[PDB]
Symmetry: D3
Subunit: 232 residues, 6 copies
């Protein structure tokens, strides 16, 4: 029993899929997993454990932003023995070579947050995903014939940014998508010795101002298939 | 009809009480407000509008941390006409003069976050509450025989901090309670020209290590906040 | 008998009013206090102790800027037993809603200085006044028919700023007045466990370019009446 | 005809292998490339162009440290059309999970330098390698029976650090090796739109005092270069 | 007529000697200069203009700390045509090879202040004195057989530092003296195209805890002699 | 017998002249020193020891950029007993008061690097030269009729800067020339208790687009080296 998660050790699988919205975790448990049972509900942050093709897998919301996400993944790892975390969600694109509904994988995560600087003595910590998980997801996508873009995500602290000119810097530096928690997750996995990966689907084009459900399903199938591939 | 709040203009009152826990918002709606009706539920972030002594008041969770808190209160202010936000929650204490169950009001909020530096050209922005709201809350508590400590909160980005020696620094500088969203709310209030206040109840003593008594003290904090709304209206 | 103050313990009252200009301290001692006697003059920084309606009160200049102000109020607090400091001065306004001759109370104080970051491990320390002092001052003004603005001051390190565009940012965030020492006084009050308040009169409008003695006298009376309201 | 490189357009291939030491570049061009010709020598910074299994490949020294390697990689990309860069060097280990003689690939590069903060408005830029190059290098090592550690390198500005306690921080965060130029190469590659990769061989263990002989190190160095050149062919597809 | 200096263009010479204490400026005008006449007195910051060996020279206090000193030197330079500033004062020593009463010249000035970072886009500005002024002062000292140490001063923002371990860092990097304004003066001189120099006398040994009036006179004679040397 | 320098204690004099390019070290040792013998060549970074008017003097390249520079000066000081270092190079001018072919001395060195912040608890370290070396070089140039500009150099981390508006800032604050290693040499010299000086010749004007022939550049460079060597003898007295 932890402060933010009302479950017991053993309730979660060693791998957890994590959308930000708890209703998306409920949607995933009911439509993609077999026999999912709810294992937590504190603060309405629903978490479930079921199986995918016989493999035990959990799915749980993490809320919005770095701080919220860090609390949950930190507790999953140190209190529930979770080894691998796959964040799943929507992101905004800033570059011309990425179109809405494209599937991006964050090999790395840039950020404007100070959390990695507080852990790394104020130097530049490169928040990165676990290589084998990236590979697994790219192979799972290829198997279904889905193209994915692997690159840097940008984890913003402020959804309603006071500095919009930063989207032009992101673009020039190849940022593939903007979300709000990947840099925090990667930071937590490094601090606690676990492995993470963030997968996103472009829901909006910040620059050009540019189905959704179906593309969401492809993202989920890719993440879940990457879990089985990762076990081999 | 915003991305994070599925309500209509007019659904929220001009004043909103905001616990971090959506289930706390539900508890407040059911036990302290009259005829409260749910006005939003995207992402399970429950929001309700009811009445306190004839005065229309809203209550809604804001989730955990500065980024989450900023999204909700920003949308509330710019799309729902919200004028006053009172965050209500639990905090940890670092100072010996403050005990568990004490009620603290955050006249200012320190932080280890970068959000106010992004807004203020990397200079020191003093994230403060609206004075009249502090004053109303302090008078409301005084009328209920409750002693409140008014000072600086500290809004942490990392609940599981990699640097626990910071708690000794906070204590040395008078921090009255440690939580996670006050500096963000005050920063948003200053950016969008609204008014905000953070009231908290000490649920844990981070230094000394110190449900019923907490529930009771939680009810005390809610009553103060709601009574400050009426004193604030005069 | 300190390095910057040549007085003895007991020479100052427990409450000190501090204009930046030592000649302003002399003015206040002579026209608002009864039987004030000079208690210090090292570096020409005049300090006086007198009585306001029977209540012992001190007034002393603190010079210009954060470093100068910190030295004096630190010595007053640790060597002279000073419990409450009320800084009084003139300030520039950046906001359109604030006019010259308006009285502002600094509940908080922003700064481009590094002093609070040196004290607070490089994180954001919110330099704020003592709530009760703010409340007393606001009550005092209300009793004299004076409308005061309570909010954020900005304490600048450079009077001749190399970056005048900061004035638009301050305005955007509600800064009520720009001066040079409130963030340092509040930081010292927090470090040594004392109480402080900054009250100012808008002498110039930095944005619009926009009696002064009269409004200055108004600010002095509010400060002195706040001390008596604060004693109850 | 740039200031630091005295070659002409077309002298370099579109993929360039880069050790820090110009003599290692000479050694690679001589022993691993066919028909290598020296194409530049400004400041004794030797650059050659040869062929590997019929494919055109260049090898060039980049000096030590971020500032020196940025100058050369920037010139190769903007003046000579280079699209892919593979840095091949030596790094020190800080983690007990990594052993001397290990082959590490920098998927990312942490640093104590300010070069990426100057480029990215003082926010945190995750200095990363090109994913497909990491994958080609990882497959190539696997195909040669070499097990590679894929993770975060740390590019130090001061070889003789004034703060050794940072090594304990690097170990806790899983840094796989400490070197001096990856974070700078990754920043340049992102700024100019090219692709980069840093591969390293562990010559010393900072934390455990472990050393290796010059024989063993030559051999492990030899493995690294074969992986890199193989990865080029895999990457071409 | 400037806000902080009540004088007219022409009242100051092109070179100004500046102790922090205005009473020290008064002592210098009366004892070292011929026919010195007071030219300013706003805020009790006395300024005087007299003659040294027939050479017109001014002496004025600048108060304590960077912010205060910056206002005065900025106004002297841009409003009163001052070309050279020599700050004179007492400093604390942190290094074992520097004893009390030694005369140190700040060829450079380190600091914990943010003022040069605000001017220099957050990079490292090396606040340095004007080389010809350093040279003139070192030669003036040699003529009178006084030994001087030329090196880095450290300009502290906080007289009562919350971080005393910084004195050991200063010592290790060769800081010759700790004072509070040299880095600010050097910054202003650079920004406004003027020349500055800080000369100090060690009044206390911060480390070892270790006449004064006479060593003060040596410092002043050296500065004034450097002015004549500098004119050749 | 250090990692980057293949010499033995006593091979270097107590004073070392240091250009960035090792071929310039060769040129100086051959043309200005008597009986110069090469004493190291690790990574093609040539170091020599010769005599000037009977006074033992060494000359050695330091590569480009702070990090490379720091490694060599740090090794000369801690492993080989060097007491004084004079960096002799080329710089770009940003101020209209400085013309191409001018000789500038860096009494101080500004920088956009983080190496002195890492050493000085994140506060502002004024990276400064040794006063008596500045004075010896200034008198030596005066004695030769050369008028030197004494001031602040700016040591850039990125030669190909992503922020060129910074040059207008350096101009406003009087920077005398832009190079890449002075702030790092001064930091090392202060960390290890040694003395250093950076002298530079203006080969190009960044702000006005002024250039100079290779002939003019050789001659101005020739003047700089004689100033430096003369400053060593004056410094000994």
């Amino acid at each position: 029993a932890t402060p933010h998660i009302n479950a017991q050790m053993g309730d979660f699988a060693d791998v957890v899929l994590m959308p930000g919205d708890p209703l998306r975790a409920k949607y995933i448990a009911e439509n993609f997993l077999d026999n999912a049972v709810q294992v937590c509900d504190v603060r309405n942050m629903f978490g479930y454990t079921g199986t995918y093709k016989g493999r035990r897998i959990s799915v749980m919301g993490h809320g919005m932003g770095i701080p919220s996400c860090s609390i949950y993944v930190t507790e999953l790892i140190k209190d529930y023995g979770v080894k691998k975390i796959i964040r799943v969600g929507s992101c905004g694109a800033v570059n011309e070579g990425i179109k809405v509904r494209d599937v991006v994988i964050g090999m790395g995560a840039c950020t404007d947050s100070k959390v990695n600087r507080i852990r790394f003595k104020d130097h530049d910590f490169a928040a990165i995903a676990d290589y084998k998980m990236v590979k697994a997801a790219e192979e799972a996508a290829k198997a279904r014939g889905i193209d994915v873009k692997v690159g840097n995500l940008f984890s913003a602290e402020l959804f309603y940014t006071p500095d919009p000119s930063m989207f032009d810097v992101m673009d020039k530096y190849g940022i593939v998508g903007v979300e709000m928690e990947a840099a925090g997750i990667y930071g937590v996995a490094a601090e606690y010795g676990a492995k993470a990966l963030a997968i996103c689907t472009v829901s909006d084009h910040i620059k050009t101002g540019e189905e959704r459900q179906n593309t969401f399903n492809e993202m989920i199938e890719i993440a879940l298939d990457s879990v089985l591939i990762g076990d081999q």
